[PDB]
Amino acid sequence: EQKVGRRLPSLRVLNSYWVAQDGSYKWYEVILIDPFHPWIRNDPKINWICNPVMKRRECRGLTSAGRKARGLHNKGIGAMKLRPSKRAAWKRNHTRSLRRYR
Amino acid sequence: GRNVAFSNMRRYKCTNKGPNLIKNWFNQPARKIRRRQTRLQKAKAIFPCPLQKLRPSVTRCSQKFNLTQRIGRGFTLRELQGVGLSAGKARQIGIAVDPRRKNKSEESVARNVARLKEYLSKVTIFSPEEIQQAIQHQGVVMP
Amino acid sequence: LKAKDLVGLSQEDLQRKLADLKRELLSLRTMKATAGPERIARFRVCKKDVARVLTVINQKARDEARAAFEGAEHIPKTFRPRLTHAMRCQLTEKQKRLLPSKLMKRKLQFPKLKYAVK
Amino acid sequence: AGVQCTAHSWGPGRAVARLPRKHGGIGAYANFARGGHMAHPTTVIRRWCRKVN
Amino acid sequence: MKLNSAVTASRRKCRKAYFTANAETRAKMMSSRLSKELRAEHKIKTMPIRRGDIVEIFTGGHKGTGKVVEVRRRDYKICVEGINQKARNPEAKPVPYPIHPSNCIIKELYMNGSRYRAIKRRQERNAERLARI
Amino acid sequence: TANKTLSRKLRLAKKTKTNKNIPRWVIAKDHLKKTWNYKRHHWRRSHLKL
Amino acid sequence: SKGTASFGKRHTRIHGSCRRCGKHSFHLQKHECASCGYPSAKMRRYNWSYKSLRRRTQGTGSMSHMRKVYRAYNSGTLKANARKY
RNA sequence: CACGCCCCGCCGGCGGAUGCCUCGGCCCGGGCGGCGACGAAGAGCGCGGCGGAGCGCGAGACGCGGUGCGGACCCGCCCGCCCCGAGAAGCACCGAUCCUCGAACGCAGCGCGCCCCGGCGCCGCCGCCUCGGCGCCUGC
RNA sequence: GGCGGGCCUGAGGCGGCGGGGGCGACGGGCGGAACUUAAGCAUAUCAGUACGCCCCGGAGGAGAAACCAACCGGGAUUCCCCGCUAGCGGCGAGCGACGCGGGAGGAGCCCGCCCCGAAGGCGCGCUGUGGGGCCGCGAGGGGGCCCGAGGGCCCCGCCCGAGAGGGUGCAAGCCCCGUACGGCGAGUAGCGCUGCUUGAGCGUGCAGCGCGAAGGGAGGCGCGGCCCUUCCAAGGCUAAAUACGCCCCGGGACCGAUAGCGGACCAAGUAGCGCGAGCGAACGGUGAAAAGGACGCCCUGCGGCCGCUCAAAAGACCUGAACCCGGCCGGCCGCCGGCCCGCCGGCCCCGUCUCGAAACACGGACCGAGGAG
RNA sequence: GCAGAGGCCCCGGGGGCGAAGGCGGCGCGCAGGCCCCGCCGGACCGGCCUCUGGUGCAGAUCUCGGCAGCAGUAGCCGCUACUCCGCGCCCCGGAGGACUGAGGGGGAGACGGGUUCCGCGGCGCCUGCAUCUGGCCGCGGGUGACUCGGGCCUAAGCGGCGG
C-alpha cells in the first residue's frame, strides 16, 4: 500500500487484497478511489474518503495493514498499552501531572 | 542514609528534550469556566430538554462494591419491554439504550423497569408558552 | 485626475488619455535629467494618473469578460469565486450530510421530540 | 535562556580559563559569565499553591 | 473599576497606546474644555483643537490668550500665536512654545461645516445619555 | 573576472548603488541625528559574496 | 607552506549565489545549494539547529498571500464560504 | 632639591558604576487554527520630487480604484488641500495590478527554441478521439 | 494467404478536474542512536529518547467488543482522579500496566455475504450500478501661599453605577483621554522456526519464511481430556470531553539594560566572521520646550575669552562610583596600641590543599559590575 | 542588611521649604549595619508587622567592561638615494644624481576583488612620521562589437531514461 500511495499521491488508498505469490516476490492488489469524481463525492456511502482527514491513509498507517502492525486489531488485555496510539499511551502513563491544588 | 524506606519513584524521563511530559494544571480555574459556558450553550439549544439523559441503575461491578448501585450506559431491550417502547422511541424520550447490556438477573430487569416507568411518568412531550416556561432537568436525571 | 471622469470617457478614448499620459511622464523625466525641479508636482501626480487611467481601463475589461463568461460554467480562472485551497476542495454541506438512503428512512421513523423532566 | 549559544570549553594550555567559550573566545553558558544560563533557572513547577484543610 | 477585561491596565500597554497612536485617536486625545459660553451654546464639554481656534492657556508657563497657529499631532503639542520663548536677538525666527491641549480653554473655535454636523452628532448622542442612555 | 555573468553584474550593481550615506534632509526630517548607513561596504575593507 | 603561502593559491570560487535562497551556498561543482536545499523540491530544514530554522522560514519575510488571506478570514471570506458550500 | 608616596583640605581629567526610570522581554491563561498550480513559504531585482537602511509595494511599484466613517492636516524643504462638502491625516472593508527565481511548469539559467500566437511541464482520475495485437473470436 | 466487425489487454493525443511544496508546536506512521546509570562492564539502562524520514488536520489518533471479569456484575472510544500495584530484571541497578471505583463527556452505524437484478450516480455498468459582532455617548475644582512649571501645601467644596489606568511642566476622581453606565469477512486465524518489542512471565504486540483450518476466539502457567462464563477476528465510517506553537488579547508577589529573548536603541538574525554546513556581537536616557549655543572682544587661520538660551548647562548630552591621572595646598607618610603626632613597642602574603605555608607549593596587576545548595 | 508582595504610620506615613543615589564628616551598635549633618543631585522613598525569595563576594589560570606601572620604553634596517631651486608637502614642475635592468619596480591579459577607473574640490578619517598627497572623503561622470570572446560543439566528466 505505501508503495502504491507514493506512486499515485492524488488517489486515496482503501484496503488491499492478495493476488498471487512466488518464492521471490509476493503480489498484493490494492483498491484505490479517486476522491474528486462527481460520482464519488455525490455518493453517500464512500463520501468519507474525500474527507481531507483521510489524506494518505497508508502513510499514517490508518489502513487495515496499519491496524494489524500497530496491533489495533487485537483488543482487550495486551493492547491496553497501544490503543490511543503506541506512542501516546506511553506518554499519558509517563507524565508528572503536578495537579495545582497539590 | 540510615533507615530510609526505599524510594519507589521513577527516574525522570525526557526532562529537557523530546516529549513534553510535564503538564502543570494552571488552567484548572480556566477549564471549569470553559466547561460551564459550553454546558450552558448546550442547555439553551433545547430549553425544555435536559442536558444529560436517564441512565440505567446498575450494580457496581466486583464483590467489593457489588451491594451498591451506579448509573450505566443504557437500558437493555428486555428492560424496554417493561415500558413497552422500541429502541428508537426510547431515544426520543431521552432514555439511553445499551442493546449490548444483558440484565444477568430477573431482579435486574425490575429495578430498571421501575426507573424507566418514572422517566415516562415525569417527562412532558411538546411538538409555545409552555416550552418557554418548561424548566429543564439540571443534573443527572434521578441520580 | 478623478476616477468618476475616467468611467465617463469611452473605452477607446481612455487609451488615448493613457498614451498622452505616458508621453507626459517621459517629457517630465527628460526635464529631471536636464536639471542642474521644484517638488515637480506634475511628475508625482502624473505617475499616479497612468495608474488611474489603467485601473478604470482594467475595471472595464474585467467586468466585461466576467459578464461574457457568466451563465457559463468552466469560468475563466480569475473570475471564479476565490475561496482558498482548503475551501475549493472541501465538500458542501449537501454532499457531507448525504446519508445512505436506508438510514434516511429510519431517521424519520423516530424524529426529535422536545421533552422536559419534572 | 543562555542555552541559545554554541560554546565548548577551550581547554588547558591556551592560558584562558576553562569555561564554555563561544567561537569568539567570549565567555558563554556559565552561571557567572555574561549571558550565561542561570545556575539553577526559576521554574513554574514550584508549588505556588499550598493546601489548607 | 475596569470591569471590561479587554481594556489594558499595564502601564506599558497604556503608554504604548499614547506614544504609537494613529491620527484619528491622536485628535481625540488632543482636546480642550470649551469656554463657559461655548459649552452652553452647543451642550458639549470638550472638543478637539483645530488650526485656527482661539484658546486661553491656563498653563503656568507661557500663559495668556491667543489663536492656535499650528497643532503638532506627533508630539501632542499645539503652537499658539503670541506665546514664544525669550529671543536672544530683537529680530529672530518667532519660535512658538508648544503647549499640550489640556492646558488650553477654547474661547472660540473654527466652525467649518463638518464641525457643526459633528457637534450636532454629539448633541444627538448626548441627548440619549441624558434620557437614561 | 573582467568577464562577468549578467546575474553577477546586477547583484554587484545593487551593492554599488546602495553604498550611500543617509540623506541630510532625511537625517533632519526624522530627527535621526545618526548618519552612518552601517550597511555601507568599503571595497577593500570588506569581502562581499563570501 | 602550510599556512600563509598556501592561501595565496586560492584563485577560484568554490561557492556561488543560489536561485532558491539567494545565499552564497550553491556549490558550482555539484550544482547543489547547501542552505537553500536546491535542486530537490524539499528545502534543507534540519532540526539539529533551531538557530538555522529561525533564520529563514515562514513569517521571516513578505508573507503577502498569507497576511491577505488570513485578513479575509478575519473579515468576509467566511461569508463566501457558506455561499460556495 | 626634585621625584615618589600619603594626599590635611581644594579644583580639574579619564571612565561608566550607582540611583531612578522605560512602547522590550519572560511566564501564565484565554481566543484562533485562517497557506499553496486561482502560483505558497521564501528569495532576487526594481519602485519615493529631493531617497541609503528598515517597512511597504510591484513597471498601475513608499501605491491605484470603489465603499462607509473621519474631519484638517502633511515628521525637512517644497506642492497640496482649505469652503456645510469641495475633503488632508487616520480607519476598516472589498475590487484589481503583480517584474525574475522558487513545489516552478517549452528546454537549460540568463541563453536557446518549436508552433500560430492559443500556446508548448509532470503524475493521476474520468470521459472523448485516433490506434496496435499470430489475446479471444466472428465474418469475408 | 489477406481483409474488416465486436470483445479484451495495451498505445498516442485532447478536455475538464485534482496532486506536489510551506508550519521550531500538537497528532499519526516509521528508521533509530549514544553519552548516561549499573560506582567496572557485555543483558539491562538512558529510551520505545534525540536525530533522520514520510504524513495529515484544526485538532489528530482512537472508537462501537473475536471487551472486561468471575459479581446480589458490568458493557464503544478519548481525557481526569485513584491505586503505582500485579509483575519484570547479571531478581542486580532499575523498571512497571490494567481491572475496578469517583468524574468530564456521551452516538451510533454501514458494506461484504445475502434476496431482487439496470428499477442505478445510465458514452459507465450484468466480473453487478441501484433498492432491501459593531457603534458610541460619558460626570464633577475654586481661591490663597508660593514655584521654571503644581499634578505642592493651606482653607474650603463638587461628581461617584465612574477613586482601573494613561497623558499633562512637581504627587490630578473634578485639565485632557478614558473608566462605570448603553444600544444596534482466508494465504486468513492458527502452528513451527528465527528476529523485533512488552511489566506480559513455556511469550505483550509484530514480522519474515515454512505450513496452513472451520464453527472459531478469550478467561493473564504450560499440555492433553471434559464443562462453564463471555465474544465474533481476518472490511469501513462516527461528534463530544483531550493536546498545542506561529498568531492576537488580557493578567502577572516576574527582569529592569553584564538583567530580561540572541535582539528594549528608526536599519538584530543585523554589523561582521567562516569556502561551506554554520556562528553571531555591541549600541537605551539633553530638557518643560531645541529655546542646539545672542552680543561681542578676538584672532595667520583654527580655536579661545566673556557670556548668551536655560530652573540648571543639562552643551552632545541625567545622576557621573572605583581604578587611575594633572594643577593647587600640605606632610614624610603600612597596620595595631600609647601619647598632639613623630617616637617607642608589637606585627612574614592572603585564600588554599595539607601531619606540616612567608614559602624557592599554587591562583591573585588594579578597580567596578555579574557570580555558586 | 537586600529585593519585591498583604497591612500600618489617629485629620491620615516622609517627599521641588529638595526623594533616591554621589561625596566628605559625626553620633550609636561587641559587630553585621545604622543614624543625622553639609555639599552634589533632581523625583521618588521608607519605618513597623506578616509574607515570598534569582538575597550579602577578595579570590574560581572566574565572565564582562574600564584601565595602571612598565613608558615617551621596545620599536618605525626588504628591495643602493636622494639633493638643489622654484610657498615647496614625501605633492607638482625645472635641473642634477642614481636605481628596477627586457624571466623588468616594463607594457598588458585569465582569475580574484567588484567601482577600487576618471575630472574637480577637500583633508574629518586613513595614508603604522608628514602631507597642501592619494588607492581616503564628497561630488558628478565612465565601459557602445555581425567580424574579439561568451552563446555554440564535444573531451574528462555529469545529468536524463519506460524502469
What is the DSSP code string of chain A? -HHHHHH-SSSEEEEEEEEEE-SS-EEEEEEEE-TT-HHHHT-TTTGGGGSGGGTTTTTTT-SHHHHHHS-TTS-STTTGGGSS-HHHHHHHHS-B---TT-
Resolution in A: 6.5
CB atoms within 10 A of CB B94: 21
DSSP F9-48: HHHHHHHHHT--PPPHHHHHHTT------SS---TTT---
CB pairs under 8 A between F and G: 7
For the record, the C-alpha cell of C83 comes out as 475561496
Stated in angstroms, how far is B9 CA from I57 C1'?
37
Partners of B22 on chain D (C-beta within 8 Å) are 45
In angstroms and rounded to an integer, the radius of gyration of the C-alpha atoms of chain G is 21
CA distance C66 to C75: 8
Residue with cell 485578513: G71
CB atoms within 10 A of CB A47: 19
CA distance D44 to D39: 16
Name the closest residue on chain B to residue C108, using Cα atoms. B88
Per DSSP, the three-state class of E56 is strand
DSSP B64-99: GGTTSEEE-S-B-HHHHHTTT--HHHHHHTTB-B-S
Give the angle F24-F27-F33 at the CA atoms, nearest 5°. 125
Residues C92 and C84 sit within 8 Å (Cβ to Cβ): no
Give Cα separations from B58 to A89, B61, B98, B108 (angstroms).
Answer: 30, 9, 12, 8
Q: Which amino acid is at B59?
A: T
Q: Is the CB of E42 less than 7 A from some atom of nucleic acid strand H?
A: no
Interchain contact, C114 vs B125, CB within 8 Å:
yes
For the record, the C-alpha cell of G58 comes out as 515562514
Phi-psi region of G59 (alpha: psi -120 to 50; beta: other; left: phi over 0): left
- What determination technique applies here? cryo-EM
Q: Which amino acid is at D42?
A: T
CA distance A14 to B15: 40
Residues A80 and A71 sit within 8 Å (Cβ to Cβ): no
CA distance F30 to B50: 66
> Cα torsion at G64, G68, G69, G74 (round to 10°)?
150
If residue B58 lies in a helix (H) or strand (E), which one and from where to where?
strand B57-59
Residues B19 and A91 sit within 8 Å (Cβ to Cβ): yes
Residues E99 and E80 sit within 8 Å (Cβ to Cβ): yes
Residue with cell 495668556: E64
Flag whether residue B40 sits within 8 Å of chain C, measured between CB atoms.
no
CA-closest candidate to residue E116, choices E42, E53, E43? E42
Interchain contact, B48 vs C112, CB within 8 Å:
no
- Please enumerate residues of G whose Cβ is less than 8 A from a Cβ of F: 16-17, 24
If residue G44 lies in a helix (H) or strand (E), which one and from where to where?
none
CB atoms within 10 A of CB G40: 10
CA distance B118 to G50: 64
Residues C115 and B93 sit within 8 Å (Cβ to Cβ): yes
For the record, the C-alpha cell of C34 comes out as 536636464
Q: Partners of E99 in the beta sheet?
A: E78
Q: Is the CB of D18 less than 7 A from some atom of nucleic acid strand J?
A: yes
Phi-psi region of B35 (alpha: psi -120 to 50; beta: other; left: phi over 0): alpha
CA-closest candidate to residue C86, choices G59, G75, A60, A55? A55
CA distance E124 to C72: 52
DSSP D5-50: S--EE--TTSSS--SEE-TTS-B-SSSSSTTPPPSS---TTS----
Residues E80 and E69 sit within 8 Å (Cβ to Cβ): yes
For the record, the C-alpha cell of B139 comes out as 443534573
Q: Which amino acid is at F19?
A: N
Flag whether residue C81 sits within 8 Å of chain G, measured between CB atoms.
yes
Give the angle B51-B56-B60 at the CA atoms, nearest 5°. 120
Flag whether residue A98 sits within 8 Å of chain D, measured between CB atoms.
yes
Interchain contact, B26 vs D45, CB within 8 Å:
no
Residues B74 and B96 sit within 8 Å (Cβ to Cβ): yes
Interchain contact, G84 vs C81, CB within 8 Å:
yes
Partners of G25 on chain F (C-beta within 8 Å) are none
For the record, the C-alpha cell of G54 comes out as 529561525
For the record, the C-alpha cell of B3 comes out as 533507615
Give the angle D21-D24-D27 at the CA atoms, nearest 5°. 35
CA distance E86 to E69: 18
- Dihedrals phi, psi of C73, to nearest 5 degrees: -90, -175
Give Cα separations from E75 to C74, E18, E21, E62, F29 (angstroms).
Answer: 57, 10, 11, 18, 14
Burial E16-40 (b: 16+ CB within 10 A, else e): eeeeebeeeeebeebbbbbbeebee
Stated in angstroms, how far is G6 CA from J105 C1'?
25
D8 is in an annotated binding site: no
CA distance B83 to B71: 19
**What's the length of chain C?**
118
Q: How far A27 CA lies from chain C's nearest CA (Å)?
A: 34
CB atoms within 10 A of CB D2: 17
Residues E17 and E92 sit within 8 Å (Cβ to Cβ): no
If residue B39 lies in a helix (H) or strand (E), which one and from where to where?
helix B28-45
Name the closest residue on chain A to residue B22, using Cα atoms. A96
Stated in angstroms, how far is E71 CA from I231 C1'?
86
- Dihedrals phi, psi of A28, to nearest 5 degrees: -105, 135
Q: Which nucleotide is nearest to F43 (CA to C1')?
A: J116
- Please enumerate residues of B whose Cβ is less than 8 A from a Cβ of A: 10, 12-14, 19, 21-26, 28
Name the closest residue on chain B to residue C107, using Cα atoms. B88
Residues E62 and E96 sit within 8 Å (Cβ to Cβ): no
Q: How far C111 CA lies from chain A's nearest CA (Å)?
A: 21
E38 Cβ neighbours under 8 A, 6+ residues apart = E106, E107, E108, E109
Q: Which chain F residues in 22-41 lie under 8 Å from chain G, judged by CB atoms?
A: none
Q: Partners of E79 in the beta sheet?
A: E70, E98
If residue B101 lies in a helix (H) or strand (E), which one and from where to where?
none
Q: Is the CB of G16 less than 7 A from some atom of nucleic acid strand H?
A: no
- Dihedrals phi, psi of G81, to nearest 5 degrees: -60, -45
Q: In chain A, which residues from 6 to 65 place their CB closer than 7 Å to nucleic acid strand H? A: 7-11, 34, 36-37
Start-to-end Cα distance in chain G: 75
CA-closest candidate to residue E108, choices E59, E61, E39, E5? E39
Flag whether residue G10 sits within 8 Å of chain C, measured between CB atoms.
no
Q: Beta strands E104-108 and G15-17: pairing type?
A: unpaired
Q: How far D16 CA lies from chain B's nearest CA (Å)?
A: 30
